[PDB]
Design a protein around this ligand. Structure first.
Ligand SMILES: [Au+]
Ligand SMILES: [Au+]
Ligand SMILES: [Au+]
Ligand SMILES: [Au+]
Lengths: 171, 171, 171, 171
């Protein structure tokens, strides 16, 4: 069970092999002799039984413990977490979509991250919260501007994720 | 210049010829003793310069006059008029989509609205407005069950339209 | 008295015991490491006396507290809560009807929702508010195509509910 | 061709046989020795080719002429006429719904007298006009109250008539 260190909004890994294992599956970003995982990533790794996270004492935090800490640091933690876990489970390599204002950005399944770029821009939405339609049309424009497809991930009232693809059309 | 009689939510045309001209291009409904147009159809034909609409006396009502009347009696006249005019201009035969909870239903440039079925289901939305996802989520469903393509026409504050498609997806 | 964590749009339950209890009576979603309830669900459970909810502090929110929070993050929280509580009380297993553009989808009290299909599709409305018929008209349609019974829940100003059915008719 | 005399909002038929034929199909009400027809009824009968209305000495009026008159007399003329004609065409004995707040009251298909009651109450609605939902629920109350079925007749944007039945439900 690889070990990581709770450092604010990130979790660091230094074990040489621990970092090699996680970099292979493409988790977090490698910065020198360290690997930086996001809080959602660490939670999912913990859930997978691969990662172990300690903060203060030598006693590693529990999923609940890390959740309690992250919910007060990250925003929409549960929203991003449920969906991230889903996509990871669907076989996707999920990476931040921050650069495009999106929640995530994904590579095709089975994509060679080496030569391939990301294809989907993902934006998560809770079913029961209304918002400006321009919020959506805006993402369709950004996605399109970067030759990427927009993926709307809805977390319905039942806690399940429903995905929709939205695009421009010329009747 | 075909003249019509504004009566509530529709315009009545008695001129046997105007009834042929309009019916030819699929505008309005031929009751037999007359042909009746919707307020949006009337506004459009006035705009084309084909129609003249009288209300209580003889002096025909200006486009803006008829337009103000319709805005007052029909909630989303602005939206519907705008998208209808646009799709009618693209050559589509624009009919009501009420049976499907939609704004319009379209038929290709030349089609016998009789033995043929509509190919598109259309829903109009002002862009700068808040909305709930179920409004779109239900539309995609209905379009699906009735095996028809869908168009989500979004009109921005400037009155411009951008059509979008939306499809359910399992990543 | 199970205790959950208010986290945006949902409530997280970590107690393996509450997870079993809630899961049994079909409440929330079991992510695996936790179970999450929707805001409407949590409100109902607080009201039922089964649950306790804590936000950014160890002091549980009162029903009126969580309720106000929810009212603020969800447009129609009032309507949906009222109808959810009522149908749940009647013994139905109330789930989301998002996929059909509806508020809820219902299963019989003795239904095995894993093997069975929902028998009702529900749409809620505030009685003393202006509406457009295409709002019911499309609902009737979807309900038909997906071969399900429908319920139009109409809540009056006092919050009292009356259910109505609607059927297409060819006289 | 039966003759009737325009009398305000009614068309009176005095002919002995004329009255006989119309009364057989159940048109108008029989008061004194004559037969009083409604403006929509008279318009329909003219459309049928059965009636000939004229204002006193003047030459008989054309469908357009009577409509021209009637429209500046009766309300929702086009609305009520479009539905009435349709229901009459479908083989129904369409009578007023006035005593119930409905537009029309219908008698089962076609063999009912005075010892036989009306089965439906009909309320016509133009598709693109919004109204308070309480208006609909009000008609369900009246219909139900008088042990009758409420028929919602919608004149859609295409000029066609769509019918829906609305009733109470106890889930
Ligand atoms: Au969440
Ligand atoms: Au407009
Ligand atoms: Au409430
Ligand atoms: Au009309």
């Amino acid at each position: 069970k690889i070990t990581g260190l709770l450092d604010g909004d990130r979790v660091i890994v230094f074990d040489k092999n621990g970092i090699s294992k996680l970099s292979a599956r493409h988790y977090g970003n490698v910065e020198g002799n360290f690997l930086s995982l996001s809080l959602v990533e660490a939670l999912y790794l913990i859930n997978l039984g691969w990662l172990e996270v300690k903060y203060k004492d030598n006693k590693p935090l529990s999923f609940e413990e890390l959740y309690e800490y992250a919910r007060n640091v990250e925003e929409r933690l549960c929203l991003k977490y449920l969906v991230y876990k889903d996509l990871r489970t669907r076989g996707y390599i999920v990476k931040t979509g921050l650069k495009y204002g999106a929640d995530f950005r994904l590579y095709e399944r089975g994509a060679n991250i080496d030569k391939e770029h990301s294809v989907y821009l993902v934006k998560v939405f809770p079913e029961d919260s209304s918002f400006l339609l321009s919020e959506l049309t805006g993402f369709v424009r950004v996605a399109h501007s970067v030759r990427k497809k927009l993926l709307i991930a809805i977390v319905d009232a039942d806690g399940d994720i429903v995905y929709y693809n939205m695009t421009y059309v010329k009747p």
